[PDB]
């Protein structure tokens, strides 16, 4: 039993103990696991949960304190179609409008990030001084062509990051007036049109609209992105 | 479809000269140009960058330990340029011979000079250290950085100066040179038995290889969910969105179970520390305590 | 059981065969018509390791070993205990991962995701591909694959890389070092980095993603972003393990000497190749 044995013996052993720890730290989120009905589960698993830690979060916006009481805060328009666990539950509606399945969002605060110095993280183009298009093909003016190659809209603004000096939307004017966002990272800018594969041209009206033009809650992010990736599923039929 | 792995129009604005804190603005230089280069991949702005006596110290320092090696292959090459640029990666600057022990008392041209650019070396990387500590700290955040540093700090500590120490002999030391470093390499497992059975050689490679998957999960699992803001992570913990949720979900439908958003970058600290946490302690272990890792490994 | 927000994600759809007949899960993982593909290889491929032991002598875990078939027996058939179940097994393996990949592109058909996961993972089946089968065939032998063991393909390793010298000399073997290195470099620095934003010193509020922006301009003058840092990520996996595979391709098929004498293209330039001097005059 030299010192070589006890080294490799020991660090097995502290590995173990390192595995537990970073486990119980990722169960600060979703935990303890629900039944199908929402009720606790009796089966936990061998792992405990973590005991509370709590962030401070800057400009004045409170603490959040994990592991805590999870709760959806929106209803659920899902239906058991079995009796036993592990099948699917079937939306009882509209799932885009309802926003179920790959159309999910979360119930996010209705506010919008900041950066470092408390300013919107996401602005508007046409409201961040000094910005502009410096590579590429600018999409401001092209037409927004859909899955159905019909033609929604066409581009009038771009939110940037501005921290991160990054396009994130593209503000596109519907047929009637009004505008909506599309995820940069659900487009093609091509050389004359943006062609957008998810969602055909008469889906784009559905997508949530934002309560101010010149800036965008967390909450309002995740119905916008929700819709437009849930598009690949239930828009599906519309896809030439 | 678009896969998000080069920009597709890139935007530019008023350089950032960054968040203030506790930073000394004195030691920040101006922004730099903006590059469209890497702006199809990250950001384009080069600079700021934050210069204190240690950055100074440790690039002043690290200047001399680069040409202490340069004028040894210079000289090496008999001052041909022809030469110099033929030998290139054949040049080394060896440790001290064994007879000299642990002694500083060398010849410049029998290991001298080799203590001399390692204290450079020394003086430059600790140095560095202390402003990976610094720099955190101007700013208010935790010491993260400097901890992992602190594990390949531990195996280049065991490698040039702890184990010959240990040995009782500087020649025990890895040369500076490119190709004769890649011997040391190689000369050092077979003179102890093969490393491939040293144990804590072969966990290192585990947490090598396996840097390499978790990071390939990560960056893959973050730009499949880009499309739901995934990768600014921070505000994931602090209020999770869709982007967390499916990001979890498709690895617990995976392989049955999934990480946070914070916890996730607890395991990749943890797998890259460990590659030379446990690759230090194998070497220094090897010709200390173990002569023969194979020999050794058949005793258990 | 559920996490306590995965319920409305639990839809029908997204599968790419057999519509609605394995469209559920099991506890936490979903199975599809690849999970049980993925069952059905995994399942035979272990029960013929089971089987090799046997024909061995052994149940240490440490000790059994299922070697391909002998160098003779070129890229032909050979007989269970003589390379078979070598041969069989690796196409049990060859379908479960390749099964594995097709389950993750059903899980992200059905969570309206990304599909590059699945496409980084077929990164790592191309590197085993190489090694068992792209580069035997094109030697013209199984026996030139290494064997299913836990350290005899360890061996395999050490007795290949050494009939080239030093197998450091390999210059795609360098390069794909070079990015195990940088990535494993910017694995550490980015794990350290959220960190040290969502959990900043005592007493202090959490850091917002500019702090980590101007910690890296402030060290070394340049930060890449918090979405090129996950791009990085993944190409710096994925270079390494296509530069492993490239290194591998071309050992023994269109490279057959020492990889050092590789680098002779360099030093024997006629030109400076005779001047005196230096390490190799
Ligand atoms: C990659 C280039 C070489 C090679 C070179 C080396 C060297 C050199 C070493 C290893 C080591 C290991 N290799 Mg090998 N290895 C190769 C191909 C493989 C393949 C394969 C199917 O292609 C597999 C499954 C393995 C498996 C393994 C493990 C036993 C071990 C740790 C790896 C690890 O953690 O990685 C990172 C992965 C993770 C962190 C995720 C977890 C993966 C777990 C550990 C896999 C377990 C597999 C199990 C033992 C076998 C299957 C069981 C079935 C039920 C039958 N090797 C090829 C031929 N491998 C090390 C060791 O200690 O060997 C004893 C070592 O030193
Ligand atoms: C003939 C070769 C031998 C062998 C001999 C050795 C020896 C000898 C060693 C390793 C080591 C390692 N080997 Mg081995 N190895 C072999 C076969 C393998 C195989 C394989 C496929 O068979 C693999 C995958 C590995 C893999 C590995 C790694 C897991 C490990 C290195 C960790 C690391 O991150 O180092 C890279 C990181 C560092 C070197 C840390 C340095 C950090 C410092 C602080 C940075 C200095 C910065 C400096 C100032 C530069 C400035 C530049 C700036 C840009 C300006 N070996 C065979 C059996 N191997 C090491 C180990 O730990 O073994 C257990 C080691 O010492
Ligand atoms: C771990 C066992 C060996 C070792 C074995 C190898 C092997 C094997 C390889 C290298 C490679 C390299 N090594 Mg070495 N290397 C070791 C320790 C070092 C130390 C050190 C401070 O101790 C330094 C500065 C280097 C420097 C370097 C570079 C010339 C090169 C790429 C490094 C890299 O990816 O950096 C990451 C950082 C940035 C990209 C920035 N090695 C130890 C002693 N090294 C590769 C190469 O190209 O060699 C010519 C290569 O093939
Ligand atoms: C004495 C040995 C020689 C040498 C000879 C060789 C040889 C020979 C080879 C390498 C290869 C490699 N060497 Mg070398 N090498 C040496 C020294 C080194 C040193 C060093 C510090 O000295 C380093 C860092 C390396 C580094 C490396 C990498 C570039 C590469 C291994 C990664 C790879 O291919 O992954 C690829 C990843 C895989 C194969 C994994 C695939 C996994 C599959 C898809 C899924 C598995 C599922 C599993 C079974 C399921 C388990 C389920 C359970 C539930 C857990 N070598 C010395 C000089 N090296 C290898 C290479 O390039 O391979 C292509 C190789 O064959
Ligand atoms: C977890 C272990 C891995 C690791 C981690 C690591 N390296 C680090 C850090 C961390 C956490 C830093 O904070 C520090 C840094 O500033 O990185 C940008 C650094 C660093 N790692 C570096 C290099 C480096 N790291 C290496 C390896 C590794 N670094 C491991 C694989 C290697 C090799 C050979 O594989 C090299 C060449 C430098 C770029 C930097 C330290 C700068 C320094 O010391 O400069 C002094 C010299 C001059 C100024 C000249
Ligand atoms: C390409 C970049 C890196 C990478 C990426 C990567 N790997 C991945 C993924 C990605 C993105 C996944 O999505 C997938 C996953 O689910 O990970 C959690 C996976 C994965 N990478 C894994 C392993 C793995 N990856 C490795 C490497 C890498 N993976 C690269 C470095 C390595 C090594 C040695 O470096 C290993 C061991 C698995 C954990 C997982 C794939 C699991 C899978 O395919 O499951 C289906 C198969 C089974 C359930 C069992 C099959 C049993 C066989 C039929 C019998 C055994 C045959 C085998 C040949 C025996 C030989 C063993 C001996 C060598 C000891
Ligand atoms: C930010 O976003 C992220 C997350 O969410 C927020 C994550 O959660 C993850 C996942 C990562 C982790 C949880 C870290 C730990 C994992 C590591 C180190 C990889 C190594 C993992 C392992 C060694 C475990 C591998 C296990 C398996 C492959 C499972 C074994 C296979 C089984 C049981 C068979 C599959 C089962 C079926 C098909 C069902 C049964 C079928 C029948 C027919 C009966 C990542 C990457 C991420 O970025
Ligand atoms: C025209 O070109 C000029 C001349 C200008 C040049 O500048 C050209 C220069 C070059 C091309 C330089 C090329 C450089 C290399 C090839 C370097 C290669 C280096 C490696 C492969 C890594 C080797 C590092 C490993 C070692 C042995 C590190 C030693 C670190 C120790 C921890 C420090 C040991 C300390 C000692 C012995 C004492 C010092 C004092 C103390 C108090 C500790
Ligand atoms: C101007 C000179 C160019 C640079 C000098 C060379 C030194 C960098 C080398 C290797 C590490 C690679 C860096 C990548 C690590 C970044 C970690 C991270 O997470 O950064 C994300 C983002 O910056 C946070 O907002
Ligand atoms: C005789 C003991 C030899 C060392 C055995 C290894 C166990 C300790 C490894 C972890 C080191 C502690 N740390 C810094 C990572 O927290
Ligand atoms: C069951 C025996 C385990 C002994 C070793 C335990 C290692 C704990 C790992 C610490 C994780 C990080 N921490 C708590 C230091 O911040
Ligand atoms: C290196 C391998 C990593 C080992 C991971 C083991 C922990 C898995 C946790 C399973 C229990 C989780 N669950 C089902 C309760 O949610
Ligand atoms: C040498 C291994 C170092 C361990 C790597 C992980 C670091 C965890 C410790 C967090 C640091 C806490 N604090 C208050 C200093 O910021
Ligand atoms: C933090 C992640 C932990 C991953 C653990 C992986 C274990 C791999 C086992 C490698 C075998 C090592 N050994 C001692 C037998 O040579
Ligand atoms: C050592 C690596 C192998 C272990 C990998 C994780 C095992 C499966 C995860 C547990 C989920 C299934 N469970 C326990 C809920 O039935
Ligand atoms: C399911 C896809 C299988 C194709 C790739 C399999 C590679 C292994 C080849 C083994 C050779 C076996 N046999 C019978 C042809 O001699
Ligand atoms: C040889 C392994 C086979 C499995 C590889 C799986 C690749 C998934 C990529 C799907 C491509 C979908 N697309 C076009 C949107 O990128
Ligand atoms: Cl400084
Ligand atoms: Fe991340």
Redesign the pocket.
Known sequence: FDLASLAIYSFWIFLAGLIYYLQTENMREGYPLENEDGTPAANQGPFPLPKPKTFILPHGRGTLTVPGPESEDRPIALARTAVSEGFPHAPTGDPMKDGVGPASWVARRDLPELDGHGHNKIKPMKAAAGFHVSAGKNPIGLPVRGCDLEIAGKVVDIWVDIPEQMARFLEVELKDGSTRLLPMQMVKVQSNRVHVNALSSDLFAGIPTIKSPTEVTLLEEDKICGYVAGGLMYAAPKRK | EYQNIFTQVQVRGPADLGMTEDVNLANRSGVGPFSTLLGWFGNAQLGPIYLGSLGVLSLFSGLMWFFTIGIWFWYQAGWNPAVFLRDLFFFSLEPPAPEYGLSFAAPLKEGGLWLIASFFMFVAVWSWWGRTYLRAQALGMGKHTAWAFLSAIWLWMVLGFIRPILMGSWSEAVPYGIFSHLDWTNNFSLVHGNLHYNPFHGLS??FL?????????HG?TILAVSRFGGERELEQIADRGTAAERAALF?RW??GFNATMEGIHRWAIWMAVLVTLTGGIGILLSGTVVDNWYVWGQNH | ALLSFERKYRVPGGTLVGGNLFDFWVGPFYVGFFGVA??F??????I??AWSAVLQGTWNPQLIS?YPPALEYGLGGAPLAKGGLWQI??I??????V???LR?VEICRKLGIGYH????????????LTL?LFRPVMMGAWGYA?????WT?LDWVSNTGYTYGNFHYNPAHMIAITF?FTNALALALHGALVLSAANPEKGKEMRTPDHEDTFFRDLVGYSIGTLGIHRLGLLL??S??FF?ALCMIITGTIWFDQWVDWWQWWVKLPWWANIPGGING
């Open positions: 490679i585990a290889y396996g840097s390499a998957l978790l990071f390939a999960m893959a690895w995976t392989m | 993925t069952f290889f995994a399942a035979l491929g272990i013929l390791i299922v097994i690796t049990c393996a060859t379908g479960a991962f099964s594995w990949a993750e996961i699945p496409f980084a993972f077929a990164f790592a089946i191309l590197a085993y068992v290494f064997p299913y063991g836990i393909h195990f996996s994925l390494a393990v492993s």
